[PDB]
Assembly symmetry: D2
Homo-oligomer: 332 residues x 4
């Protein structure tokens, strides 16, 4: 599939990188009114957390040339004015974080785009999580959402645990690496006061609808999950801490077994499994949506257990956006 990407931020750049490192889709256009061609070369080439881009990045003839492939560049604030159709872009990845509504994201279709994938939760667009409910997608859906990075980490795990033991209720906490929405020093945040406090100095409590969203991709869990988060001073990689009450008795060993089996089969590449003495950095640039940490979790009894799963909030999610588009194309 030929793809267009709106917004060249962390998500836009990593989705583009994933498209190229994996070769699964072909990026032929990028739109960003604030980042010009030459700056794009720089931002895509050098990455503090994921390293310098493996391949080539040059600006040739007004176009961004990555690994030899020329990419048309646009500078439109209003997506409706982006000529995706002329660039040959069939699918458009909406990653600005500003057009997450069915209506706003629809603006891309007015330029030639056949379909739009919102790289963020949507209030009305149907949300999908690879490995959990992506087969519920059909050709009538012109605008879809790939949910959030945290939802993509919890949903795969929640599905396995619920199918095998039945989740009566659960509460999650995600210890999250600092994000771009945060501030370097105590600054104005207006909406969320705690988010304005110095990121590198604090452990910051924050709200998140990721746990509740899992009830949307896994209907049986609707109303049985919710949680919150703590933003901590690490550049990348976060972890889900799921405390849940199980319906059927489950020894910790059986939980490991069931998850391991899932990571080697139906959820391979999506849900990972490890028993090694890992730490956050061991998952930097890891493409999994969620990686179960056997040794980190702990059970109180056969019905009350705390499960731990890692996720490169940047890389994993970006790869799922590409995997979602591949699945969609196979349904055309």
């Amino acid at each position: 599939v030929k793809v267009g990407v709106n917004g060249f931020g962390r998500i836009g750049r990593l989705v583009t990188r994933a498209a190229f490192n994996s070769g699964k889709v072909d990026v032929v256009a990028i739109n960003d009114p604030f980042i010009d061609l030459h700056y794009m070369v720089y931002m895509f080439q050098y990455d503090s957390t994921h390293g310098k881009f493996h391949g080539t990045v040059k600006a040739e003839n007004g176009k961004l040339v990555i690994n030899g492939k020329a990419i048309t560049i646009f500078q439109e604030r209003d997506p409706a004015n982006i000529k995706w159709g002329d660039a040959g872009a069939e699918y458009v990845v909406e990653s600005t974080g500003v057009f997450t509504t069915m209506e706003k994201a629809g603006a891309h279709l007015k330029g030639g785009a056949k379909r739009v994938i919102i790289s963020a939760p949507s209030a009305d667009a149907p949300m999908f999580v690879m490995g959990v409910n992506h087969e519920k997608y059909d050709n009538s859906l012109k605008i879809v959402s790939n949910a959030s990075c945290t939802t993509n980490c919890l949903a795969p795990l929640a599905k396995v645990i619920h199918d095998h033991f039945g989740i009566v209720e659960g509460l999650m906490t995600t210890v999250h690496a600092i994000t771009a929405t945060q501030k370097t020093v105590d600054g104005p945040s207006g909406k969320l006061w705690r988010d304005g406090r110095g990121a590198a100095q604090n452990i910051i409590p924050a709200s998140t609808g990721a746990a509740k969203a899992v009830g949307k991709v896994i209907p049986e869990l609707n109303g049985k999950l919710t949680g919150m988060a703590f933003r901590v001073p690490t550049p990348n990689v976060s972890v889900v801490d799921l405390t849940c009450r199980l319906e059927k008795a489950a020894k910790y060993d059986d939980i490991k077994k069931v998850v391991k089996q899932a990571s080697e089969g139906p959820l391979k590449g999506i849900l990972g499994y490890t028993e090694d003495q890992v730490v956050s950095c061991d998952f930097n640039s890891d493409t999994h949506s969620s990686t179960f940490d056997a040794g980190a979790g702990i059970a109180l009894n056969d019905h009350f257990v705390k499960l731990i799963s890692w996720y490169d909030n940047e890389f994993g999610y970006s790869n799922r956006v590409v995997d979602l588009m591949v699945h969609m194309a196979s349904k055309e």
Copy 2:
């Protein structure tokens, strides 16, 4: 009561700092075979996380003089060889971390010390948590433990929640600040492989018996609590994340009501309460053992909730060591 302190590390120094700013407890002797008199002046005077000491510190005639009070300095590696008696130390704070058992801490009694307070969990010494079970102490106890910093944060909260609603079962996680036990860069730790990884770069999973210990200071909770921890790159101040099942239905507001009332009454100074948009640094040098964060927590339903409480793992605990000694002296 005249006090002696063994080990001049973070706790030894902060307990001494807490003592001098307090009043009724006097430090008259300090032992540390690794830190010489002049180095002690430096380490006690300058503190990266708590600021320069407010008062005077000097090296005079071989003694450490703080705020004018001369302190006898010892350099024994064997606690059995410390002459606490000659120096006048009735109570000895055992804070090295390598003499936590009854059999080892008793050594201080050879030099004349009358009672020994272990500033850490003990495998056999009776453990106490101010505000929770300190009333259980009696004059026959010559060696006691003040438990851990994390246990001192969870116990006060657990007591209030259990007294009013009944904790059926709970699982905690403590997002914990960096400790002197970790390494600056990936280094050796043959016992706990994960703790050897770069502290500033990672979110590090770790085991902790703090939750299980609460079942020791609150017998009714024995076997109903356990948890683990995540070490993150912040210099000080940690937070307890308690997910528990309640027996009696409890609206979040009722929980707020009850906790707040406890902090203004029986647990004043021990358990704090706030509804402000706080972050970890707001508890820097806070002397509370635990401070309930009303806005950070969240409930799934009237019987399943996640409670959040802050604690300056260094300052709070150090002040409780002093408070424990004051209580003991009042029972002599």
Copy 3:
């Protein structure tokens, strides 16, 4: 003197904090379109790096009440609209960082303000550095600049070294703490690309005109100094690294003696002096503009030396803004 402050950011808030601590000036008005009254209470009360404000802060009948004194709050986006005169503000501290020109800062005059102090370098407004050239100010100056935090650290030191030994030429490097202008993760920064890279992960080279500016407050040094900077992942406190060649031979002990005498006399409170084994945190909330670190520096020979001086980039500078206004008032 009745003072008004525009912009309630790190400096606006710290200048206000500095003002209340010592009744040198009375803040009677504040303006900031991005921070409403209630948010101001929060931002001023809680400070990650300098601690909770010691005193009281509340929102009463539409005014910000600090330590009892009620403060008129304005929310004008345009400086000209701000009715400084009405509220009773003689001097106005221009700390937004956007109106640093003579032309722009003059707008405060159109509102009733008598004098205007720009808390940042100015392209045309006369710049002053307490202890170095503040004696050059006169009643005809309605708009002045207090230079930069780095210039205030280097100038005092440069003056003493030049007065006694003569600086033939010098090059400085300032290892700087992070500022509100940096990003938490690799993000866009059109004018300064390096400044867009993750602040907590990198040592970031940056340009600075602070060294060249010293030639402006000390005319004899015009064209004899320049330098650059390295932004590093520390919340606050920076250090100047001055490498200079001397005209008159100077043993290192002579440099120490000369700096020590200056800090105890004419530059007391401005230029500090220490021989202790200090690190950056030992200067947190230190009100000096520059503190000479005797043990940190090193000389190659009697004419080529490297001098080290610390400065709390936030606190020191904020106090100098207040000291500058006090001096101005004494000249009215």
Copy 4:
């Protein structure tokens, strides 16, 4: 050439990694009487700063098998006892940081090894810096030193600048990333009080003989260089800040010209050159010994300049240890 490595710390592991990542040499033995075979697999496989090993690491029959190549493991505490001879270890990399002297390091020769390379400065062993004085090595030298990481960064640059313009005198400052020698929180380090202070919280001044050592690999510069360092909270990658006086007038562009040609010719792979807007992370895992940052430096005049050069203190140096051995082998 077959190699043995004594010490499996940061240096030992990265030298081993470099050996396989290049294939210039072949590691056949590792001696570390403090790290168990299974722990070695873990420490070599997972690396916080350089990522998971891009290969294979098992533990087949008492040996460490990397990329399908078996390595004999030793737990000998006295180098003399190691059987380098039987294993086929022609050269031994002494990287413990303990056996640095000509005699302590000599302990390896008895074990059957032909030559010993000390991965650290030596008080009496001849020191070499690839690209600067490695041609001075001859077959009579059984024990050699590869100097320090900082010396390997400054020497290449100093050689080029001195060769073309003549360095009259210079003073350097190295802004250094966090090292193992440091402590996570204020701890004991009696020799150097400042090195014991919390690494993640401070900018720590430290002494370094790297600048003076350049006078030993470049004799003409003996006594013309010295400097110091600042430890900052970054995991890896450091930068040299060289302020020097030139004999021959040199415009900044002439310096760029000369350094660039040197990086494309005689010093290719050793001295790098860039004009891009780089930051520390852009040099993570960079194998150069030193990379000139054109845009970061600044000149006061044609005879006084500040030159900036980056170096991955871990990776660059480790690769030079391998390059030194390759050169030695070619002289056999």
